[PDB]
Homo-oligomer: A and B are copies of this chain.
Amino acid sequence: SVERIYQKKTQLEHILLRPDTYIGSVELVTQQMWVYDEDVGINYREVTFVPGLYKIFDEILVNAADNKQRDPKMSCIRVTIDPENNLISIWNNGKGIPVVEHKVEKMYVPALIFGQLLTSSNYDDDEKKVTGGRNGYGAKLCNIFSTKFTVETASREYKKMFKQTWMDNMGRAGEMELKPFNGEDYTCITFQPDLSKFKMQSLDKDIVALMVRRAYDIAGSTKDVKVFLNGNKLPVKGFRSYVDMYLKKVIHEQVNHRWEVCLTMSEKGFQQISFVNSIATSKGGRHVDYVADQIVTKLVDVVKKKKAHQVKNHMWIFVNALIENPTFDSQTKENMTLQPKSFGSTCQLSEKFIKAAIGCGIVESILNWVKFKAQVQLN
């Protein structure tokens, strides 16, 4: 009775019992957002989907992009989505995971970091890294919310390939397969999400449209990384070309190795599209405020010569950023809360960018509008 009332849970039990604490809502939500629809392409519409499901997909995708930082020679990511077989796989090149036994934990590294909770190569903050990874949960969460989860990685350096399958919400695992290897390194994560945990029958149009858009995001946000979807190379060559998809006048600057900015006029209020370490910061954050307010200030002062949030409300801004040890207001990670002083870099836009921005069709809209309101009489 005392023993029935007061309980202790294992870590694994707890995640399944309280999923929203780890992956966010396991219920449907409906909201407006950009997705990539088949035949139509990038568009803004109402979408109904489960955040938790999006999240576990996003964890594996971001992990692939994280590997770019670990190994700049990485050049490709391949994504496969198969609704009929309820099957998703995410492949990447560049250095594989060390296929070797961990001397402290007494298991092979891949099995450790995909099969045991609280495991990461990003737990040392002294190293100052710009990965999306930070907590050591992501890959495990995908595993816990999958009926089958397969890890395959190949390490030339250790001359071996590792392959292992987990099943039933990481409740059991198949035998670990090792083989000799000396090819080019790859990692492939293949999983079948547990749709009953998300109250879904299949990977419907909406969730797929989101997942597909993330592939495009990765193509846009990473450097010198080709992205394939299913089989086809995505026609996105860097951030500029990514931004072009959203448009049918645009100002651009690659400020430095960690910041890239595009700006155009908005007629629907302040808009932002942004990324931090290849994470989609859909609700913005201090990184967007940092760049935007810098532009706002300069444009307000030009307007003063002949109003602040009003200037900002005419802006559509696109930001790709690499931030050290980023922080977010929730799981979901839609809003990045780290202060600019801790970013690890600055982003001072060039005078050329600012000058082009003063043109751009913007200070003009505001001035015409303000001249107009002076002409209006209410009768």
Contact = CB atoms under 8 A, between A and B. Distances in A.
Given A102-B2, A330-B331, A116 B8 contact: yes
A20 B375 CA distance: 52
Contacts of A100: 2
A45 interface: no
Interface string A106-146: 00010011001011110110000000001110000000000
A137 to B, nearest CB: 8
A247 interface: no
A133 to B, nearest CB: 11
A153 to B, nearest CB: 13
B3 A104 contact: yes
A226 to B, nearest CB: 27
Interface stretch (A9-17, A164-172, A264-272, A315-323): A9-17
Contacts of A220: none
Interface in A238-253: none
Interface in A64-118: 98, 100, 102-105, 109, 112-113, 116, 118
Interface stretch (A21-29, A36-44, A180-188, A208-216): A21-29
Interface residues of A, number: 53
Nearest to A28: B339
Interface in A319-352: 327-332, 337-339
A18 interface: yes
B7 A121 contact: yes
B8 A119 contact: yes
Dominant SS among interface residues on chain A: loop
Contacts of A103: 2-3
A141 B8 CA distance: 16
Contact of A20 (B3, B8, B9, B327): B327
Contacts of A109: 2, 6
A96 to B, nearest CB: 13
A20 B125 CA distance: 15
A169 to B, nearest CB: 17
A7 B376 contact: no
B6 A329 contact: no
Nearest to A113: B6
3 pairs of A and B residues whose beta carbons are closest in the complex: A330-B330, A9-B118, A374-B379
21 contacts: A2-B98, A3-B102, A4-B124, A6-B98, A6-B102, A6-B120, A8-B116, A9-B119, A9-B136, A14-B135, A20-B337, A21-B135, A25-B329, A27-B327, A27-B337, A329-B332, A330-B331, A373-B379, A374-B378, A375-B376, A376-B376
Interface of A: 2-11, 14, 17-18, 20-21, 24-25, 27, 98, 100, 102-105, 109, 112-113, 116, 118-121, 123-124, 134-136, 327-332, 337-339, 373-379
